[PDB]
Every structure is written in structure tokens, then in C-alpha cells.
């Protein structure tokens, strides 16, 4: 339990989105057995999308559903030996990230064709400058998986919280998730305001809160697997604390960050005057605050407590 002073929201079209969530990944070759389908439904991935994107319905919401489907199918391809070899991790991430640049060869693994279909749908109808900034966010995410594989290979665990966050902030995938809230909402935050120091601090709070929530929710699955790059394990190594002290420390950190997040929300009216936002930009920035940044913070908190997540080698083979 944590202090998330934000209203819980869920798309009114969530029942349909959960009922139809399997048709897209099955048609892409991402779910190939019936047991794989049930394993997927147990993740609650359409549920998570409907809470990340409460403002989306219909096809817009289905794009968010497919993003969560692909994202967790993708992340599963690295829990095994591939996530241990940075050469093989890079080999796969480069075939996925290639879709950001052009058409994939038909020999690409299905996980890459899945990403290509999502990225094609994310960009259509957005400004080219928005597509380029989002493609950069994806490349940061893929490169982060190669850094995590480098840490496991050379058996160099993250010795500090600082060194962990510099790596986990990219692999958590929050920024590509927030980017899709703009696409699913059919709006764009003023690009000069996205780059502002105030917005970056708010975005960084949303990332930190998410990875802290995830490191606590999946501590058992990572303790039973000897993983050393988890915030509760790193705090015990960095500060010599117990498990009960590090966990309560992480509650205080998500506590302090969400109060600082409120402080920054109150600065946005002044931030808009600084960048001379017209009324339309003022509204798009308001939508970004409530339908993209707030939703990625609150939506993750509700879903980490309800997700069942707390044989796929075919998807990464040419
Ligand atoms: C791109 C997205 C998800 C991809 C899957 C990712 C990055 C999952 C990151 O969590 P992991 O520690 O790698 O494994 P887990 O499933 O939690 O045991 C959006 C979901 C946002 C999250 C924020 F925390 C997922 F936890
Ligand atoms: Mg994982
Ligand atoms: Mg991972
Ligand atoms: Mg985890």
C-alpha cells in the first residue's frame, strides 16, 4: 500500500477490450498455443491498458491493449539465457528496433513484426516531430535491455540506487507508454513544454514511482530466481539495511515523490506563460497532465495489486 493521491480511472470500453485482446497477437504469431493464450489473459494486460488509457475507446484503446500485450511478450523473451548474453540480447533488440527506420524483412522474428504493426499504428496521424521523439524513446528502451544483459553477463550487480535508476528508468518502458496516451487521445503536449525542466521532473517522478512499485510487486518472483538488480536488494547492499527497512524506505520515497509531483503540477500555469502557450496549447498540456502523466502513475498502482503476473522462444527466432 502506498500514497497515490490520484483518482482511479478505467476506460468505459474495457470489457470489449479484454474480450478481444487475443485476436491481434494470435494473428501476429505472438500467441501460438492455447496455454500461451491463458497465460496471457492471466496477466491482465487489457486491464492495465484500460487504466493507462481511460480516455481511449474502440480502436484507440485496442492500440493500447496491443502495446501492453507486445511489451510483456517482449520482456518475457529475456527472463532466460538470452537476458544473460548481451550479444544475443542486442541481436534481437536490433531486429525489433529496425522497424523504427523502415520495413522489416519477412525473415524477422514475430516479436519484431508485432512491434512494427504497433509502431505503424502509433505514428499515423501524428506530427513527424512527435514520431521522431517517440522513436527515440523506443531506442532508449531497447538499448536498456542490452545494458541489463551486460550487467548480468559480467556479474557486475548495480552497487547503488543511482546506478540502478540510470538503467531501470529506460527498461521500465514508462515513456513509450505515456507516448501512446497522446496517440490514443489524439492530442500532443506542446513540444517545447515536453522538453521543459518542470515536465521532465514530473515525467521522471512517474518513471521512478512505476519502477519502485514494480520492484516491490515482483520481489518474490525475483528472489526465487537469485536476481540482484532489484531496488530492495540494492538498498540492502548499498546501505546495509534489512528487507523491512528498505521496503519502508521505498514507501517513503514514493510518498515524497508524489507530493513533489503535486508541487510541480501547480507550477504548470506559470510554465505555460513562460513558453507563451496559447489557449489550445494550454488545454493540450492539461490533457497530457491528466490523461497521460496522472494515468501512468495511478493506473500502474491499481494493476500491480490485481495482476496475475505477480515456450515463447518461437517469437524471437527468425
Ligand atoms: C512497456 C511496458 C511494459 C513492458 C514490460 C516491462 C518493461 C516490464 C518491467 O518489469 P520487469 O522487472 O522487467 O518484469 P516484471 O514483469 O515486472 O516481473 C509498459 C508497462 C509499464 C510498466 C511500469 F512499471 C510495467 F511494469
Ligand atoms: Mg521481466
Ligand atoms: Mg527485464
Ligand atoms: Mg520486476
Curated annotation (Swiss-Prot):
Binds 3 Mg(2+) ions per subunit. Its EC number is 4.2.3.7. GO terms for molecular function: metal ion binding; pentalenene synthase activity. Disulfide bonds join 123-131. Changing residue 304 to F: 17-fold decrease in activity. 5-fold increase in Km for FPP. Keywords: Antibiotic biosynthesis, Disulfide bond, Lyase, Magnesium, Metal-binding. Changing residue 304 to S: 3-fold decrease in activity. A motif (DDXXD motif) lies at residues 75-79. Mg(2+) 1 binds at residues 75, 79. One of its GO terms (biological process) is antibiotic biosynthetic process. CDD domains: Terpene_cyclase_nonplant_C1. Changing residue 304 to C: 4-fold decrease in activity. Optimum pH is 8.2-8.4. Pathway: Sesquiterpene biosynthesis; pentalenene biosynthesis; pentalenene from farnesyl diphosphate: step 1/1; Antibiotic biosynthesis; pentalenolactone biosynthesis. The Asp-Asp-Xaa-Xaa-Asp/Glu (DDXXD/E) motif is important for the catalytic activity, presumably through binding to Mg(2+). NCBIfam families: PentlnSynPtlA. All the mutants retained substantial pentalenene synthase activity accompanied by production of varying proportions of abortive cyclization products such as germacrene A, protoilludene and beta-caryophyllene. This is a true derailment or diversion of the normal cyclization reaction, and not simply the consequence of trapping of a normally cryptic, cationic intermediate. Belongs to the terpene synthase family. This is Pentalenene synthase. It comes from Streptomyces exfoliatus.
Amino acid at each position: 500500500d502506498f500514497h497515490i493521491p490520484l483518482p482511479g480511472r478505467q476506460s468505459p470500453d474495457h470489457a470489449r477490450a479484454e474480450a478481444e485482446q487475443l485476436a491481434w497477437p494470435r494473428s501476429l504469431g505472438l500467441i501460438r498455443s492455447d496455454a500461451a493464450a491463458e497465460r496471457h489473459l492471466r496477466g491482465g494486460y487489457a486491464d492495465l491498458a484500460s487504466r493507462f488509457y481511460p480516455h481511449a475507446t474502440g480502436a484507440d484503446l485496442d492500440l493500447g491493449v496491443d502495446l501492453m500485450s507486445w511489451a510483456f511478450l517482449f520482456d518475457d523473451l529475456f527472463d532466460g539465457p538470452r537476458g544473460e548474453n548481451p550479444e544475443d540480447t542486442k541481436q534481437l533488440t536490433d531486429q525489433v528496433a529496425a522497424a523504427l527506420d523502415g520495413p522489416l524483412p519477412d525473415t524477422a522474428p514475430p516479436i519484431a513484426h508485432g512491434f512494427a504493426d504497433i509502431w505503424r499504428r502509433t505514428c499515423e496521424g501524428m506530427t513527424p516531430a512527435w514520431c521522431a521523439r517517440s522513436a527515440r524513446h523506443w531506442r532508449n528502451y531497447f538499448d536498456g535491455y542490452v545494458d541489463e544483459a551486460e550487467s548480468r553477463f559480467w556479474n557486475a550487480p548495480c552497487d547503488s540506487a543511482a546506478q540502478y535508476l540510470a538503467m531501470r528508468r529506460h527498461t521500465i518502458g514508462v515513456q513509450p507508454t505515456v507516448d501512446l496516451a497522446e496517440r490514443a487521445g489524439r492530442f500532443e503536449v506542446p513540444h517545447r513544454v515536453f522538453d521543459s525542466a518542470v515536465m521532465s521532473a514530473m515525467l521522471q517522478i512517474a518513471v521512478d514511482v512505476n519502477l519502485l512499485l514494480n520492484d516491490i510487486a515482483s520481489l518474490e518472483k525475483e528472489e526465487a530466481r537469485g536476481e540482484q538488480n532489484n531496488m530492495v536488494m540494492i538498498l540492502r547492499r548499498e546501505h546495509g539495511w534489512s528487507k523491512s527497512r528498505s521496503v519502508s524506505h521505498m514507501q517513503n520515497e514514493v510518498r515524497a515523490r508524489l507530493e513533489q509531483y503535486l508541487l510541480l503540477e501547480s507550477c504548470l500555469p506559470k510554465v505555460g506563460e513562460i513558453y507563451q502557450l496559447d489557449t489550445a496549447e494550454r488545454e493540450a498540456l492539461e490533457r497530457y497532465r491528466t490523461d497521460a502523466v496522472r494515468t501512468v502513475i495511478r493506473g500502474s498502482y491499481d494493476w500491480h495489486r490485481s495482476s496475475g503476473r505477480y515456450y515463447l522462444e518461437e517469437l524471437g527466432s527468425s
